[PDB]
Design a protein around this ligand. Structure first.
Ligand code: POV
Ligand code: POV
Ligand code: POV
Ligand code: POV
Ligand code: POV
Ligand code: POV
Ligand code: POV
Ligand code: POV
Ligand code: POV
Ligand code: POV
Ligand code: POV
Lengths: 511, 114, 70, 114
């Protein structure tokens, strides 16, 4: 029927720009590209697509009201293998090959995004994996490829990966979009692709390792000298350099965190503080040191509290740098998940029980007689709460001869608190964080690498306009006579193909 | 006993060392933070506070971690509220978080080396 | 794994108990609409549920309304 | 038989009856689910709620939730009409009622303690 309508003069380039066709909640509509060709591509109808491409008025490069094209629409409707099949990747390949031009993948929609960048932003790992490692065997259109096999000698092949919009050197790049964005769940598996992983590795082994070590050393020395000048207070011409360096480095951290918070999005502030908590605590420590010296300059007695809090927070903030090593990185992210998942629930329930039993026990004791003040340790509400807290941590001695008019009820409430906290709550907490470290046992080699990639990209952004001339690898990428752009040599070993190498580029293997 | 010995080996190098490293960082940081909140003792008095020096504060936190001694909050601190806040923070971070997570972690260790 | 259900069982019990707590009035908060099927009388109630699946790929014949959406 | 399937714990038969769609037009009033429209991979279906919604004394939802002599009670509430009905009820009136009960009991306990 579609062929009969098309052969009779149907509007191929008609745009279904209705409101139902462009949904906002993804529950009351179905977005396909607002084009019959895009609808045929998105609904797994290959025969209709091929019938539509070869026609006298079909516009493959048509852009709908969202600025999207057929490749953008195929990227948006793409999904994992569980929900749908791989037909979108096959349709993407077929339409791109039939078009035979680079204008489809270099067209930006009404968001400043290419279909490659849109696939990186939307979380489509399968489509991004296809595009990043796209190799075309035929020589009629080989400039459309992004991966080129330079040579392949036996089970050893060297492939060149294009890095046009992938390396963080073209404003909005695939690497920066994959790492910095937060509104996706498959962020970990997208960084395991061939060019992105290798690029992160080489960046870390080139400049990010020394930058992270320098930051660790400077913060460690700053914390050490802050501790030394605060603990050895009078309660020094050669010792003035330490406190001046404390002030200078605190101001530097304060302004750095201020400019890193000012442009901070409210989207990464979601989840549970897994990517911005250290920014806040570093800023708080910096302004605590600033306020400490601010009150120390004048006659303010409440200046040592901020300084001591700065020492404690600064020595607590030094655990951020444990992400440089692998095992300590796993330990740090597991501290994060544990302290937010089940430490908070245990604290909430324990505080409810502690305050309830503390105010119940403090009401069972009458006033002390004349010339007596140490009749009972559970005197006030704060005293009873402190006694229950001391009992929970195993400190002190259990005394049951208090000034309670109902000692049996007092002992019953005390034993009930003992069971509920020491037997039930604490031991169940130990049992629960075993399940937590069981689940995050496998989900720790990725999140730590996500933090490492964030630090690498932040350190690279810290570099000035110069000194950034440390690009990936070489200039020659493909057979194109002009604008070779960049490349990235990756060697792969596999003993299962055993095929004749025809897509090879260079006759001489190796350097 | 051979299995017990090699599991001692893996445990004491895998997660006992990490726990010791993090605990020592917290212990020394909180010990030097608490020792700075207490002024000098008055005349004819030397037992005003158990957190007198840095070594004394570190020893008191170590005694608190192992469950020995008695918790005394009436020290010679000019800011007793901040002193109690830091003490409770150390209690949570070590007794609630670090030690119990260590017990949870070496369960995974003895599961893999089982 | 046996915690996402039992909690929902308790939640359903609380929902039904709270609905029973409502008087004879104020309970006029029925599910959805009145038109359900092609029957000319006693349309009773209905409940609109939207489902998404990319595996069937079949021509829709059991459809009821030609115009999708509201 | 629908209520008997809900009471006896037969989740498969209840799943068939609740989502029973008949393609042929000779007897379509026997269906309980009707597809209003289906545009691409998006379809809107209408589910009958004659004896399912808690408005006809002994209903399928009340029987499924309130009864206790079954073991597959959890999987019976995951069906298409019952889940959605519980969701909308919670998001309509049960959320505010539960919050009001929590606030009133919290204030009552606070003032009793005081
Ligand atoms: C399993 C158990 C482990 C612990 C579980 C938790 C247990 C928590 C329970 C704690 C209660 C312990 C006893 C409280 C003190 C009672 C006596 C007292 O001094 O009262 C004081 C109140 O005291 C306070 O308000 C203390 C400071 C806050 C306590 C909570 C800290 C939580 C830190 C969490 C950090 C984040 C989490 C950390 C990790 C991220 C009154 O003041 P004063 O000193 O009497 O004198 C007044 C001063 N004046 C004279 C100048 C006017
Ligand atoms: C979860 C918790 C569990 C523990 C966790 C770890 C906690 C660690 C924390 C420990 C701190 C405890 C308090 C320290 C002492 C303070 C007071 C003091 O005496 O100061 C003294 C310093 O003291 C030292 O230097 C002590 C010796 C080394 C301590 C670390 C041993 C680690 C062993 C690890 C073995 C390998 C691992 C084992 C497995 C393979 C000063 O000397 P003095 O005595 O005051 O007098 C001076 C002498 N004079 C007069 C002659 C000049
Ligand atoms: C509340 C939970 C805090 C811990 C937490 O969020 O985890 C942290 C890890 O955790 C660590 O590695 C330890 C953090 C230091 C100790 C935390 C308790 C505060 C002590 C206070 C002592 C008294 C001072 C009180 C001052 C008011 C956060 O780690 P993350 O989320 O993986 O980091 C990602 C953020 N980034 C990408 C920007 C780098
Ligand atoms: C969106 C973000 C954009 C930021 C742009 C800022 C302006 C850029 C322009 C200018 C800033 C230039 C550097 C400022 C240094 C002071 C700042 C400081 O406190 O130390 C910095 C360290 O940074 C270094 O280690 C300095 C390296 C300088 C360049 C030399 C590299 C040589 C490599 C030779 C190789 C052969 C900050 O360290 P951090 O690890 O970030 O701190 C961790 C805390 N946090 C996780 C909460 C952050
Ligand atoms: C030691 C405790 C002192 C007290 C701290 C107290 C506070 C506790 C807080 C933190 C302590 C625990 C975490 C420390 C993290 C900082 C170091 C770091 O990031 O190293 C890293 C970079 O550093 C280098 O290896 C430097 C290389 C030379 C730099 C030259 C600059 C000029 C090492 O990285 P890596 O993953 O080993 O390198 C990968 C390559 N490999 C796998 C093949 C090896
Ligand atoms: C100052 C500290 C307050 C800091 C508040 C931060 C809230 C973090 C919440 C959090 O980690 O959620 C946890 C639950 O957590 C709860 O259920 C929390 C219940 C209230 C206790 C809050 C601390 C009480 C401390 C004493 C007063 C995680 O729960 P989940 O089942 O993993 O939730 C899945 C979704 N999520 C992982 C995206 C969260
Ligand atoms: C984190 C937020 C959570 C908790 C923080 C603490 C909340 C309560 C604060 C009270 C502090 C106070 O000043 O109390 C005073 C009295 O006050 C009472 O006796 C109050 C009794 C009711 C509230 C506490 C018990 C129930 C809490 C249920 C759980 C709540 C939620 C828990 C959420 C996890 C102290 O009285 P006192 O020590 O006798 O003072 C001596 C002087 N006097 C004898 C002249 C009076
Ligand atoms: C509830 C009903 C009232 C309980 C209180 C009884 C009265 C009471 O104070 O008795 C006791 C607490 O009371 C107990 O023995 C309570 C034991 C736990 C109650 C909950 C069990 C579950 C304590 O009473 P007494 O003053 O130590 O001696 C009782 C005097 N008489 C035996 C002569 C009566
Ligand atoms: C005197 C004692 C010092 C003895 C040093 C020996 C180092 C052993 C390291 C070790 O067992 O690695 C562990 C990590 O371990 C860490 O991450 C260690 C971090 C520093 C803490 C070192 C002890 C601190 C004691 C207080 C100061 C094992 O980590 P992993 O993830 O299993 O690493 C895989 C590779 N591997 C098994 C081959 C190691
Ligand atoms: C294993 C290696 C790790 C750790 C071993 C121990 C490292 C520090 C050693 C100091 C010992 C010393 O003599 O201190 C002295 C002071 O010194 C201080 O007060 C130093 C304060 C800064 C360092 C400790 C806190 C931060 C450590 C962060 C973590 C570091 C890395 C952790 C890696 C796991 C003792 O002072 P005092 O007791 O008051 O002496 C009485 C006499 N007086 C009053 C006249 C002064
Ligand atoms: C940070 C901003 C400054 C904090 C210190 C405030 C000043 C201070 O020493 O107050 C308290 C600590 O201070 C607290 O009460 C700290 C409570 C925990 C802070 C972090 C919470 C997370 C202790 O102060 P104080 O001398 O016991 O009495 C205060 C006097 N005033 C109430 C008349 C002012």
């Amino acid at each position: 029927i579609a062929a009969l309508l098309i052969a009779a003069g149907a509007d191929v380039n008609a745009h279904a720009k209705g409101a139902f066709f462009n949904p906002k909640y993804q529950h009351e509509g179905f977005y396909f590209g607002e084009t019959p060709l895009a609808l045929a591509a998105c609904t797994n109808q290959p025969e209709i697509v091929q019938l539509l491409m070869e026609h006298e008025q079909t516009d493959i490069t048509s852009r709908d009201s969202r600025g999207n094209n057929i490749l953008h629409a195929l990227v948006t409707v793409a999904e994992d293998f569980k929900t749908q099949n791989d037909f979108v990747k096959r349709m993407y390949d077929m339409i791109l090959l039939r078009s035979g031009n680079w204008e489809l993948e270099t067209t930006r929609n009404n968001d400043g995004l290419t279909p490659l960048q849109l696939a990186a932003k939307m979380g489509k790992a399968e489509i991004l994996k296809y595009i990043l490692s796209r190799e075309i065997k035929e020589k009629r259109l080989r400039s459309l490829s992004r991966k080129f096999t330079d040579w392949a000698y036996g089970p050893v092949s060297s492939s060149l990966y294009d890095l046009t919009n992938v390396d963080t050197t073209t404003d909005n790049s695939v690497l920066e979009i994959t790492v910095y964005n937060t509104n996706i769940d498959n962020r970990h598996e997208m960084l395991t692709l061939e060019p992105l992983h290798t690029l992160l590795h080489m960046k870390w082994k080139k400049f990010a390792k020394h930058m992270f070590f320098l930051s660790f050393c400077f913060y460690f020395f700053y914390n050490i000298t802050l501790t030394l000048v605060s603990y050895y207070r009078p309660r020094g011409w050669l010792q003035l350099l330490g406190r001046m360096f404390v002030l200078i480095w605190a101001m530097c951290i304060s302004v750095k965190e201020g400019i890193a918070i000012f442009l901070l999005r409210p989207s990464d502030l979601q989840s549970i503080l897994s990517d911005a908590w250290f920014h806040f605590v570093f800023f708080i420590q910096a302004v605590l040191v600033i306020l400490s010296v601010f009150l120390y300059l004048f006659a303010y007695k409440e200046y040592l509290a901020c300084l001591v809090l700065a020492m404690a927070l600064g020595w607590a903030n030094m655990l951020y740098y444990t992400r440089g090593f692998q095992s300590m990185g796993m330990y740090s992210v597991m501290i994060q998940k544990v302290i937010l998942h089940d430490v908070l629930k245990f604290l909430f329930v324990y505080i409810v029980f502690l305050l309830g039993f503390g105010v119940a026990l403090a009401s069972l004791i009458e006033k002390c007689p004349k010339d007596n003040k140490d009749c009972s340790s559970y005197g006030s509400f704060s005293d009873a709460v402190l006694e229950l807290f001391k009992l929970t941590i195993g400190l002190g001695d259990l005394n049951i001869q208090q000034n309670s008019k109902y000692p049996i009820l007092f002992l019953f409430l005390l034993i009930t608190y003992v069971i509920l906290t020491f037997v039930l709550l604490l031991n169940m907490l130990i049992a629960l964080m075993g399940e937590t470290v069981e689940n995050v046992s496998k989900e720790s080699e990725r999140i730590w690498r996500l933090q490492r990639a964030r630090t690498i990209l932040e350190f690279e952004k810290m570099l000035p306009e110069w000194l950034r001339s440390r690009f990936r690898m070489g200039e020659l990428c493909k057979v194109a006579e002009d604008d070779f752009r960049l490349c990235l040599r990756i060697n792969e070993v596999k003993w299962t193909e055993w095929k004749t190498h025809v897509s090879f580029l260079n006759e001489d293997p190796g350097p």
